[PDB]
Each structure stands twice: as C-alpha cells, then as structure tokens.
Design a protein that fits this description.
The complex is a heterooctamer, with 4 copies of chain A (about 140 residues) and 4 copies of chain B (about 325 residues).
Chain A (H helix, E strand, L loop, with lengths): L1 H14 L9 H10 L8 H9 L12 H6 L5 H12 L11 H10 L6 H11 L9 H8 L3
Helix pairs in contact in A: 2-3, 5-8, 6-7
Chain B lengths: L1 H10 L5 H23 L6 H4 L2 H22 L10 H8 L2 H20 L3 H11 L11 H10 L3 H23 L15 H12 L12 H18 L2 H40 L10 H23 L12 H12 L1
Helix pairs in contact in B: 2-4, 2-7, 4-6, 6-7, 8-12, 9-10, 9-11, 12-13
The chains are: A mainly alpha (about 140), B mainly alpha (about 325).
Bound molecules: ligand PT5 (2 copies) and calcium ion (8 copies).
PDB class: membrane protein
Keywords: potassium channel complex, membrane protein
Assembly: octameric
Chain lengths: ~140, ~325, ~325, ~325, ~325, ~140, ~140, ~140
C-alpha cells in the first residue's frame, strides 16, 4: 500500500529527472520518447490537464496517488465501458462477432498488436461461436 | 506526401477561416466581374467597361487555369483517382467538366476576339458563378428532398395545371371579343388567355391582361383563390424536407464522430487490464501509470463525445420514462 | 388466362418502365394535340392547324376507342366485374364514363363537321388531359386531406371572406366619388369594390383599381396585411396533410409486404419440425435437406422484409429505451 | 319539457342534416339578400332591386325576429339562464346582442324609410352575415391560436414594420425629385413612400408607384426580398397552431366519450358480482341472466369506445416498446 | 437599496401592467411624433407641423435624457456594472449606445437649428422607434433561429439567385429589341432584365416591364413558377424555428421555476426529521408544529410547481407506457 | 351443472311465453317490464345482437348456455375491467378516493342504489383511508 | 396519544392568546415573531389556507390533530420527496455529490445552518465517497 | 454423427447425379421435380445463394454439413419466429384464435395440408379455448 505509493513517487521523480515532486510535462514527454512510445504531440498537456486536479502543470502529486486510487472497476467506469461497446452492437444484439470485433479493434482508434487482438478474441469468446457477449467482456475487463 | 493532402484539403472540402477567406475572395472577384458585365451594356458607361473586360478576363482565365491544373495535381491522395485513368475519372466529374469548359472557352474567346469580345463572354461570366460551390453540397440536398416527396409535388402540380388549363379556357371563352379602355382587345387568342392564367395562378399579376365582362371576373376570382392555394404548396413540403434532411445529416455526422472514442476506450481498457505481461523491470514501472493516464484521457474524450445531444432539448419525449426504467433496473 | 391478367396490369395499375413508356407516350401525344389546339386560333398560323386537327383528331379517336374496347375486354380478371352486369358496373366508374363520353363526342363531331369542326373539339381536347391519370390516384389523396382538415379550412375561409366583405364595403364608402388620373372613376359600384377586394386579398394586385383618398389607403393597407395572412393559410395545412398521408400510405404498404414473409416462415418452420412423418425411404433422404434449404430461404426473406424502417432514421425517439428494455429482459 | 330541449338543440348547437338544412337555408337567403344589395347600386339594374329590397327586407326582419323570440323562449333548459335575470344574462351574450341590434335597426329603418331606404340598409345586410355561425365556434379558435403564439407574431410584425419604415424612408430619400414617363412625380411626400412600402412588403405590387433612380431600385429589391420573407411568417405559425388545436379538441372529445362506458361497465360488473342478495324466487331466476346480458352489452360498448385511436396510425412511435413491456410483464 | 432595485426592475426587464402602461405610453408618444413627421412634408399641412416639431422634439429630448440618466443610476444593482468601469461597460451595451447617440444628436440639432431643423430630425425620429424594445428580446430570437438553419437558407437563396441570373439573361436575350405599345423599349439593358427578374421572382409583379415575344413569355412562365417556389422557402423554415425556439425557452423557464420548490422541500423535510435537537422547553412545544406547517406548505408548493405540463396535452405520446411501467414497478 | 342449464332453459321458455326455444325479444321486453325494469327502448335488440351468435333474433339457445359458460372471471375480462378503472385514476395514482368513487358511481352511467354505493365503498375500502386500490377492487369483483 | 393531542390543543390556545379553539392567524404570527422566526409576511395566511380544511381562518382544530395524523412517512410523501431529489440528479445518476448537495442546500431556498448542512452530509454520506444515493437519504428521512 | 454426415453427402451426390461433391443446382431442380415438388422457378438459385457460403454454385459441401449444424433451436431463430407470430397478434394479445390461425395458415404464403392445419391447431391449442399463446407454440416448435 504505502510502499507502492512511495515507489510510484520515486518513479515519478525519476521520470521528472529531478527529486522535486513535479509533473514535468516536458520531462514526461522525454521519458515517453525514451520508452519508445514517442508521443509526437502535446498529448502530455491534456494528460496532465486530466491528471492535475489543480491544473498547475507540476504539483506535489496532486491526484497521482488519487489517480491510482480510482478503482478502475467502479460501476461508474463499467457503465461507461458497456456504453462504449453499445456503439458497435445492433438493437439488443450484443454478441458482436469476433471478425467485426477484430476489424474495429485493429482498423480504428490506434491499432493494437494483431496477436493481442487474437488473444482478446480468445479470452472474450470461449464458446467459439460468432457470439461474444459484451457483458462477459466488460465483466472480465473490470473483474481484476 | 503531406503537401498533396494539405493542398487537396485547401481546394476541395474546405474548412476553417484560412480556406473561407480564399473561397470568399474568389467568389467576390467573380461577382465583381459579373457586375462589370452588367455595366458593359447600359449604353451610358459602355466605353468604361468594354475594354477592361479583356484584361480582367484574361487575368481571371489564367488564375482559374492555374487553380484547375493545381487541383488536378492533388488526385494522388484519392484512392480511386490514382493513375492516369484515375485522373481521367476525376476529370469525369461534372464540376470539373464545367471548369474545363469555362477555361477552354474563355481562352478561345480571348484568342479570337483580339485577332465584340464581350458578345460571347457574358454567358461564360454567368457559368463562372456555378464553380463556386465545391463538392456539389447544394444540388444533392435539393435532389434528395425533391425525390423523397416525389408524389406530393407531382399531384399538386397536376391539379394546378389542370385548373389553369380549364379556367383559362373558360376565361378566353367569356372574353373572346371585348375591347379594353385603350382601344385594343386583350384576349386575342387562346395563348393570350394561357398567359393570363400563368400570371394569375402564380400570383404575379402584372396587369397587362385583365378580364372585362362580368362572367370573366367571377371565373377569374374563383381560379385565383382555388389555384393559388394549390400552386403555393411546394414551399411547405420542400421546407420541412430540407429541415429534416439537414437534421438527419447532422445526427449521422455526430454518430460517426462517436466511434473513434469508443474504439480508443475499448483498446486502452484492454491494454490497461493486461498489465501482467506485454534490465526489463525499470521500464515496466512507468508503463502502468502511462496506460492509466491514457485510459483516463480516453474516458474523458468518450464522455465528451457522448455528452452532446445533437434541437438540443430533445429528451422531453422520453424524460420520465428513462429514469423510471433506470430505477426499475436498480431494483 | 394469363393474357387477360397481363393486359389488365398493363392498362390499369401500371408498374415499370415498360408501361411508363406507353403512358408517357400517350400523354405526350395528348399534349401535342393540345398545343396544336393553341396555335389553331392565333390568327397568324390558323391555316396551318385548321385542317390537321381533323386527321390527327380521327387518328386519336380511333386509338382511344381501341384502347377503351381493349381495357373493357380485361374485366374478366376482376372478381366483381365478371358477367354482363360486371362489365356494366365497370363502365359505371367515373373515369371510364369520361373516356366513353370523350370517345362518342369526338366521333359525333368528326361525323358532323365533315358532312367549324375546331369550334367544338377544343373542349374535348381539354377533357382528354384528364384520362391520363388512371385509378384516380390523385383526386382521392386531395379529397382525403381536405376532408381531414375540414374545420380549419372552413374557419379560415370564413374569416377571410368576412374581412373581404367588410373592408371592401368600407373602401367603397370612402371612394364612392373620386376620379383617377385618366379621367374616369374606379369604384363606380359596390361590385367594383368587391373586385378590388378579391384582387387585393389574394395578393394578385393587378393595378386596374387603386384607392385614392387618404381614408381609402389606410383601410387598404390594414385589409391587405390582416387578410392576406388569413387567406394564405390553406397552403401549410394541406402541405403537412399531404406529407403525413403519403407517409401513412407508405407504412401501410410496407406492412402489407411484411405478412407473406411471416406466413411462409411459420409454414416452413412447422414443415421442418414435423420431419417425423408427412421404396419410400430414398425419397425421404432429401426432403429433409430441401425443407432446411427452403427454411433458410424463408428466414432470409423474412429478415430482409423486417429490416427496412420505412424518414429512415426514425428510431432516435426510442433508441436508448429499447436497448434498456432489452437488457432488462436479459436479466 | 322535452319540447324546449329539442328546440334549443335545433337552434343552438345544431347537429345532423335536419338542422344543417335549416342553417344552410337561412345562410343562402342571407347571401341572396346580399347579392341583391350588390346589384342595387350598379346603376344599370338599380330599378330592378331598389324596391324589392323593402319587401324582402321586411320579410327577413319578421323571420329573424320570430327566430330571436323563439330562441329566447328556450332559456329555461339552461341551468344558468333560468329566471328573468337568466334571460337577461342570456341576452347579455355578444351574438344575441348583435341579433337584437340587427332586428331593431332593420325595424327602425323600415319604419322611417316608408314614412333612400337602401342607403342605410346595406351595412345591416352585412352584419346579418355574422349571425350565421352560432356558439362562436370560429372566433374562439382564432383567439386561442393567436394568444398561444403571442410572441412570434409580435416579433415578426415588429421586424417587418421596422424594415418597412427604414427602407421606405431611404427610398423616399433617393427618389424625392424624379419624374416618371407620364410627366408626374410619384414619391411626392413621405406618406407616398410609406404607401409604396406597404404595397411592396406585402407583395401586392399594384404598379402605381415604381422607383426610378438606380439607387432606388437596389433598396427596393433588398427590401422586397428581406421583408416579404418576414411579413409572410404568420401563415405557417397560425396554420400549425390551428391543426394542433383541432387535434387537441378532438382528443378531448373522444376522452369525454370514453367515461360513460367505463362508468356503466364498473356499475354493471358490481351489480353482476353481488348476485347474492339485492313468491320472491321466480323473479330472481331471470334477474341474473338479464344482468349478464347488460354486462355483456357494457363490455361490448366499452371495447367499442376504447377501440378508436382518435392521425389514426399514431402508435408507430411506441409500437415495439408496448409489446416488449407487455411480454416482460407476462414473465 | 430597495429603491435602486425597484427602479431597475421598472426600467429594464419590465413586468406587470404598472410598467406596461409606461412603456406603451412612451411608444405611443414616439409613434405620434413619427406621424407628425409624416405630415410635415405633405406640402399641404406643412405649416401645421413645421414648427411644433421643435417644441415636441425638445420635450421628448429632455424626457429621454432624464430616462437615460436615471437608468444609468441603477447600475449599482448589477454585480458586473458596479464601479466606474461598471457604468462604462453598461454604456458599452448597443441599445444604450443608440440611446446616447439619439440624445446627443437631438440636442445638437435642436441647438444648431435655432441658431431646416426638420431636414435632419426625421432620421432620428426613425431611430427612436428602436429603443422601445428593451433587453433586445427580439433580435436575439431572430439571430438564433437564422443561425440554426444556416444551411437551408443559404442553399435556397443560392438556387433562387442562380435561377434569377440565368433566366433573366435569357429573357434579355429574347427581348433585346422589341417595342411595347407605348412606343418605348423595355429591356434596354441587362440591368433592366435583372430588375424584371427581381420583380417577378419575388412575385411582386409591378407591371412596368413585361416580356413581349413568344420566346420571352415561355421563359417568364417557367422562371416565375420554378423560382417563386424556391424564393418562398424561408417563410416555413423560420416559422417552425420560431415556434420551436419559443417552446424551448418556455420549458427552460418552467424548469428554472421548479428548483426553488424542491430545495425548500428537501430543506424543510430535513428540518422536520431532525426534531430531536436543534426554560428551553415551552419554546420547543411549538417549533415542531410550525415545522410541520411549513413542511405542508412546501409540499403544497412543490406539487403546484410540478403539476403543469408547460402544448399542455403532450403526454399522449407516452400515456400508456408510463402507467404500464408504474404498475410493473408495483409488482 | 346440467340441472342449472335445464332450469335456465325452462326460465327462458317461460319468459318467451312459449315452450319453443326462442329468444322472443318482444316477450323478453315484456318480461323485463313485468320485472319492474322497464327497458323503455329496444335495448333487447342490441342484447340479442350480442346474445345471438347467429343473429337470428330467436334461436334454440345458440349461445345462452355459452353466455353462462363465459367464466366472467377470465383474464380477458379482468383486464378490461382494470382498464375501465384507469379512466378515473391519475398517473400511477390508483387508490381513487371513496368520495370520487361514490360521485362517479351515482352521477354517471345509470345511478345505482345509494346504500349499494356505500356497501361497495365499504367492501373495497377496508383500511378507511382515502385510498382504495383498483387492483383489490377488481380482484374481489372477479374473485367469486 | 390523547395526552399529546390535549397538550397540543393547550399549546395552540396559548399561541392564540385565548382559551378559544381558534387558529388566530395574527396571534400565530405574533407567536412566531416571539419565537425569533419573524415571518415578515402573511405566510400564516397560506399556512392556514393549507391547515384549515374549511378555510375558516380560525376553527376548533379542524385538521390540526389531523395534520399531526398525516404519517409524514406515507408513500404519498416519500414519492414526492424522491421526486424532489430528482431535480438535482442527472440521468440515472443519483449519488449527488456532497459538494453539490451542500451548495444547493445553503445557496437556494432558505439557507440552513452550515453545521446542519455538514451534519446532513455526514448522516446521508457514510462511505465518504462523492456518491450519496438519494434513495438512502429519503429512506432515513421518512424512516423515523 | 459422422455416419449421418456421410449418408447426407452420399444423398447429395445421388441428387447431383454424380459422385462429385457439387451442389448441381440444375440436378437439384431435377431431383425436386422427381420428388413431385416441382419448383417451377429458379428457387434453387436463391437456395444455393443462401446454402453456398462461397457462392460457387457447386462446392464440396461448403456449408451443407454446417447448414445441418445450425441448431434450428438456437435463440437467434426462436426470437425471429416469435417475431413472426407478432405480425398476427394485437397489442399484448397473443392467444391468436384457432380460426384466425387456420385462416392465415391456409390462405397465405403457400397453403399447407388442411389436415396438417388441424393437427397444428390441436397440437398448439390443448385447452380448447380460442386462445393459443404464441409462446407455447414457438416453445414446442423449437423444443425438438
Ligand atoms: C435554370 C438553371 C438552374 C440551374 C442550372 C443547371 C442545373 C445543373 C447544374 C449542375 C449540377 C450538378 C450537380 C452535381 C452534384 C454532384 O457532384 O453530386 C452527384 C449527385 O447529384 C445529385 O444528387 C443530382 C441532383 C440534381 C438536382 C438538379 C436540380 C454525384 O454524387 P454521387 O451520387 O455519384 O456520389 C459521390 C461521387 O461518387 C463522388 O465522385 C465521390 O467523391 P469523393 O468524395 O472524392 O469520393 C463521393 O464520395 P463521398 O461519399 O466520399 O463524398 C460520392 O458520394
Ligand atoms: C433595415 C434595418 C433593419 C434593422 C436595423 C438594424 C439592425 C440592428 C439593430 C440593433 C440590434 C441589436 C441587437 C442587440 C441584442 C442584444 O443586446 O443581445 C446581444 C446578442 O444579439 C444577438 O443575438 C445578435 C442578433 C443579430 C440579428 C440581426 C438581425 C448580446 O447578448 P450577449 O450574447 O452578449 O449576452 C447578454 C449580454 O452579455 C448582456 O450584457 C447581459 O445582460 P444582464 O442581463 O444585465 O447580465 C445578458 O445577461 P443575462 O443572460 O443574465 O440576460 C447576456 O445574456
Ligand atoms: Ca520536476
Ligand atoms: Ca499540478
Ligand atoms: Ca318463443
Ligand atoms: Ca338467434
Ligand atoms: Ca383565538
Ligand atoms: Ca378554520
Ligand atoms: Ca455434381
Ligand atoms: Ca458453392
């Protein structure tokens, strides 16, 4: 609990390239470029805009530990995720086909790894039929 | 390359003030050329505009030729316009055909008039007004809304035309020999009565032909009322159709906006869940929090996309029903 | 026989370009005859059309008589038009009565004019324009939409007529003795003021009668505004009614299409279920798979029939409610 | 007594062809008197109608006086019009006041004209046209629909009037000294420009006043377009309001019809259930089956009352939702 | 202080007959001044109004200056108009700018004209008509409803203007040399044909210019029909938009009324529930019943606020669905 | 069962004033007038129209025994009766007040006995509050 | 039961400044001013309008004891109160935040005591999250 | 299982009049005409269009065994069938009468055997009343 918070604070200081408790959006972008995930834009700007409760650009962990504290399995997120699946489903259809799911997953938004797409299809769809209910998918996604 | 894409965006499918300025400028220049074409035949300022309509015309011709050859160079971006056959099918478009026709005709008229140049250039100056609206975003709307209501318009025009024919024949029969105050006869033939009918039914009412005998005035009154009210119908039908069609297009646009958000949300959520497995440890210390950051960003964007309702207050027809269903599901 | 049915389909209730061509051709020929009737009284091309309107007239008469006697021969298909009394009640229809009247009158005029033939033929040439729309698919729509809104039209016409009467009387009272610029008096009687009122209220405004005194102009302005806005009402009411009625008819047609699919689906499903009992074995080896094939075909056709929504995007008023109810039922 | 009630039903709140005939007849007679009033001032058939408009007038006066005194005798049926003060408040109604005014004025004019009788009788002959619509079923609808949209009409009239004022002033400023082709000046004052503005904005366009200078024509065109489109607004608003208000009234009428059925059904069902206790046995043998008979009749009438939907096909907005809810309740 | 607030309420955002009287009076006085401006140039009553338009003008100027300086004194109530910069930004408003301009210009004209005073005062007397509608409650509605439908209006105006241009050019081409009955030529230039087109398309139809050749009349008829029906579109769109926007504003007002009731109800209910703890006993004997009294009052007010439906009968689209859901929840 | 049908047939013959199995609408009206319940109209016409399956005006008990056979408690009648109460109830109100119920019961349709109205109010409303649920009323009405 | 009714009648007579069983709206306003809660308006007028069943202005406890008899926990009041909370809640939201609840409670209607607002927030919201369901609030409010 | 698939493949080859694994639409029509069920049209065209996953017109059992594999009792078919009955039923009616059911079954689509219609009416309607619920009908139809 507290050890994880301290380790995350140390990692944030390391990414900030300084011992100060600052977000350091430019240092965060540099660390992202070092991680191979070159942002190529000011994505860190909006990220901090959502990650900085006070909007200071760099604060002594204003909501970073609080960001972690967001359960990420709370019903206020499972509802949103289930609504996100509703965009691809017909009236009371659900069961969106593995083919359509793979298609929308790789050809839209940002493309994921093809093997990751196949792994997700195998994880969600176990019966093997062309029917993967969105409820089971969101249930396992917000399960653990 | 990015250059071709930016150019195609600036020339076709414009968006933003940066392209609005250019299009408004070219349209204002076309309209100023047209206003110079008006004053070139007033016979009181003819010498002022009979000569400048050559230099201005050749300047506009060179400008539009450059614009045409540049917009042709941007056919590589389109997936169907690549290749020589692709450029050919791009030039197959009607608006591009009109632009090419205007260009070549202006060039030919400029070449022949200097070897009465205004005599033929006016109709071209008219056709330049048509190349202003790109992508044909105007005629498609009208075509669709006329084709949807293709049965009400036909029946109202049929009834109006039948009333016109019959009533104008009766008027001609009642006024075949009657002299006006100026000493001439108005309804000389049946075509003259048809002209009176087309002027009365559409409620123009010039006043060159007016019925005289007491049996003509009654039919004129009955026709005016009962057929003006039938020829005036296309206004309401087309208006409601236009409004409804624009609303449908706006909803389709908003729903096509909604999809990328949901895709990013699903993908990022799955990436965050599979935090088990994609010095290889210090890197893994920050990938988790970065995935959490982009997940929060995706949730924000998705909530911002599903938030609007586009007319905004359209939930009053299902306000209490939805909350009732929600609380029922809660139990 | 199939011949009588195909003929009846080609003559009444037409569908497809094969019948569209024929009907458009006969209508174009009727309109060309009418245009020949217009030029036959212009007194400058009279000799060009005073004689051809006999040969063309007898040709059209023979053609329409043949068409009438052929469409009469197709009364055997109709369940109510079989028998001699059936043919009689078929001829009892109004459109057939008009066709018979036109035929016999054209024949009689052609017989008498050759024993001034144009003097009477013009009104017949008018009535030929009416036999173009078969099944009366035009007048029934108008009748229905006028009868539905039979109270708004009556009240608006009553208010408009009352305003017309009162305001035109006041105008006549204010202009009973006043001379125009040309030296005559305009509002000589009260009928002349009524004529002015009927020309102003419907916004025709010929310009033969204009009020002169300062007390006439005020009443003219007030009447023009407050009664043009009341006589112009039938346009919107009838327009909305037409649109709504056509939508209702389209929905009824789609729902009448839906039924055969459901019937075939139920029947085929029951046939597939009772695969137990209807060398009598080798035949039974394939009846099962053929029943499965036709069952799949029926499911396909039924899904294709219930798929359309006919205006197509009409589910936005119940979009979230239906999915909420569905997922509630899932639990 | 039943006589007074039947008379009141025949005179006020008429229903059925038996009263339709009477009202149509009295209206046709009033209109024929009015048409006799038109021809009485044409100065070419004056002697034909200058004398009959006395005998016909006194006949109509006696008829309407009898009708008035008879409809007065039917005030006993109304719960609020009983008594002398009740008859007084009945006569307090506006339509009855108009009828009494017409009666007494016609009587006085007939008495004085026989001791120029047409000179005053015409305005009365106008006012007789107003007593035709009983119960004021016309003016209340218009009043309600104007009062509902009391803000859109005010703003459109305000904008139109402001445009009229400003644009007509500018036109007068641009044409203060310019002579037409006939040798006179049109825009002599500013009131003349206001007259031109009121004739142009409402799209009457007589043609007595037309701007001449090139600076007048531009303002005239801009005003015509941008203010015709704003003065033509009350047509659509009032039309939609009329349609909606008539639909609301029809629904209220149907729902007020529904209540007696439900009351009879509840009462008869309770009477049938309490068949235990209200030679006293043989009578009880048939009361049960008679109660069952009237109960079946009540169920039939109630099903016949809740069956209609009054526009009839209005369930398409909640078609699938209702059946889904029903089958959900079944489970 | 309460004085400043009451004054601001009486001057801006008026409500009730007490302020209605004042505003109607000032508007009637402005209109009477304008009518005095009309008669001041008729050249037949000029001496009657050439002098009073100085004393009346200075009286109105003093009145409006007092009204302006008094409404300026009420800027302390507004949270954003406090301070000298607050008064400056209050005067920054457009309506206040117009009022100040009118005041200073009237003062300057009165000072200079007495040291032809009517020559300049008329345009000011026009602008006084604009300061009558306070808070700009008229122009905002029109702006919003035009901006909402900004695509249908643009396309209909574009189509109408294109038809106007092309058809008027063809008419000019067909009538370039043809003399009317009065001995002059009508379509002298192309601007004259454009004038004819703008007069025909908007259905004004003055009658100064009418086509003559048989090829002109055909184009005139086709243009009149097919472009009157397209220029007459803004009436329906703007009308439906106005109605819908006023309905939305009314609903927003009712919902903003609903909130104080709910707040009072929640607060009073919580106060009633916590009756345990806020000679200190005799006082506590009545606080309970007083809390119950105000709680009953709050329940009454809340039921009275949620009772209205504002068009009132709008529940027919969800009548049976809501009761079905309610009884389903009961089970 | 059969005894009741035979007794009802005998009573119908007695009301018909003849041993023939005829409805005898005129004789039925005469018997109703004898029962004090003077119809005063041709109500028997519509009654037979609903009671005569074949519409013969007089038939050998075409649906009379079948009319009895109508359970009168079947859901197809309880639904209609519950819909009849819905006319007097606000949105999800039910519980229509004894005062309003008595008012609509005596002042509309055909007036019932005042004591019968009070008895019905007492039977339906037992808690004594101004809330008599329509569901309980229809439940007891179609109970037995 | 009866003792409470008698004590309330005595208190009403004391507030009326007379032994007569009268509402005494003016005396009620005087007693309210004495209680510190100066009405400053004719609020007692509307209060009696709702508290006087016959609208007499002063009657021998026409519905005062009946006013008490209103359970104040009856479903016909819990439904209204739950509808009152619905004004501040988004679609199926509930869980209105303690911040928003305090804001609307103190800045609208009549302001309550700030400590009372905090006490209500603590009573309704026990989990401490920014989610206080309206159902639990109305349940405790109409509980006792 | 496998024996049934092999027997069906042999029967398809026999209907194809050749040992090749071809659909043989013309041979299928000839076999249908031999079965008395003369198609009289190119119904086999659309049949194969639905039966040939690849649309080849003749393939080595592309989805024939898969066509069999369609459970024909899956909820994705029972839902469609229950929707098909909804066309003939009023609002929440169900219970479509045996008379109306027989009428629509014999006079619409393709007419079935009259005795088959009576057998279906007897199978679905067991209580004998004029009320045959569509749910029970679809339940037995997709039962076995
Ligand atoms: C007096 C004089 C008065 C006026 C003077 C003269 C009248 C004529 C003037 C010129 C009119 C031309 C209009 C041409 C409009 C036009 O280009 O649209 C027509 C349909 O037009 C109608 O609906 C037809 C509507 C006709 C209505 C007539 C009224 C063809 O549109 P389309 O149905 O072929 O579909 C287009 C087309 O395939 C494009 O090539 C394609 O372009 P890309 O975007 O590059 O792929 C589009 O793809 P997207 O879906 O991705 O956008 C397609 O959506
Ligand atoms: C030929 C001649 C014909 C006509 C002759 C000439 C034409 C021009 C005449 C003068 C026109 C002026 C209109 C000015 C209307 C006006 O004042 O409104 C404009 C927007 O106007 C449009 O939407 C703009 C609409 C333009 C439509 C043009 C048509 C500014 O409104 P705004 O959007 O700035 O918002 C106001 C503004 O901030 C106020 O200062 C503020 O006042 P307080 O109430 O004291 O706080 C308001 O606060 P509330 O929300 O609490 O009420 C705000 O709601
Ligand atoms: Ca740092
Ligand atoms: Ca910060
Ligand atoms: Ca008998
Ligand atoms: Ca019978
Ligand atoms: Ca007292
Ligand atoms: Ca009292
Ligand atoms: Ca083969
Ligand atoms: Ca194949």
């Amino acid at each position: 609990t507290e050890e994880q918070i301290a380790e995350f604070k140390e990692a944030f200081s390391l990414f900030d390239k300084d011992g100060d408790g600052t977000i350091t959006t430019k240092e965060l972008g540099t660390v992202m470029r070092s991680l191979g995930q070159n942002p190529t834009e000011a994505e860190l700007q909006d990220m901090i805009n959502e990650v900085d409760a006070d909007g200071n650009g760099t604060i002594d962990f204003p909501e970073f530990l609080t960001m972690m504290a967001r359960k990420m399995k709370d019903t206020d997120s499972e509802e949103e995720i289930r609504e996100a699946f509703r965009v691809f489903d017909k009236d009371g259809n659900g069961y969106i086909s593995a083919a359509e799911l793979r298609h929308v997953m790789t050809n839209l938004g940002e493309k994921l790894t093809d093997e990751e797409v196949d792994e997700m299809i195998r994880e969600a769809d176990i019966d093997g039929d062309g029917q993967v209910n969105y409820e089971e998918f969101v249930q396992m996604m917000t399960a653990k | 390359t990015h250059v071709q894409g930016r150019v195609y965006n600036f020339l076709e499918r414009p968006t933003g003030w940066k392209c609005f300025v250019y299009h408004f400028a070219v349209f204002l220049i076309v309209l100023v050329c047209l206003i110079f074409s008006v004053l070139s035949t007033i016979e009181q300022y003819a010498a002022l505009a009979t000569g400048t309509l050559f230099w201005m015309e050749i300047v506009l011709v060179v400008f539009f030729g450059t614009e045409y050859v540049v917009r042709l160079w941007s056919a590589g971006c389109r997936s169907k316009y690549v290749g020589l056959w692709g450029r050919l099918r791009f030039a197959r478009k009607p608006i591009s055909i009109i632009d090419l026709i205007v260009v070549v005709a202006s060039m030919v008229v400029l070449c022949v008039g200097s070897k009465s140049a205004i005599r033929g250039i006016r109709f071209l100056q008219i056709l330049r007004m048509l190349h202003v609206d790109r992508q044909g975003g105007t005629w498609r709307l009208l075509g669709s809304v006329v084709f949807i209501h293709r049965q009400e318009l036909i029946t109202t025009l049929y009834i109006g035309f039948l009333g016109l024919i019959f009533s104008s024949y009766f008027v001609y029969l009642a006024e075949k020999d009657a002299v006006n105050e100026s000493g001439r006869v108005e309804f000389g033939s049946y075509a003259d009565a048809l002209w009176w009918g087309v002027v009365t039914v559409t409620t123009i009412g010039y006043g060159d032909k007016v019925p005289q005998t007491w049996v003509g005035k009654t039919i004129a009154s009955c026709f005016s009322v009962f057929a003006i009210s039938f020829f005036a119908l296309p206004a309401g039908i087309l208006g409601s159709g236009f409004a409804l069609k624009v609303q449908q297009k706006q909803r389709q646009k908003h729903f096509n906006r909604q999809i990328p958000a949901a895709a990013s949300l699903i993908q990022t959520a799955w990436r965050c869940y599979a935090a088990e497995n994609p010095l290889r440890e210090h890197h893994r210390a920050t990938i988790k929090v970065i995935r959490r950051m982009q997940y929060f960003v995706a949730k924000k964007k998705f909530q911002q996309a599903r938030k609007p309702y586009d007319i905004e207050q359209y939930s009053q027809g299902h306000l209490n029903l939805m909350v009732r269903i929600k609380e029922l599901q809660r139990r």
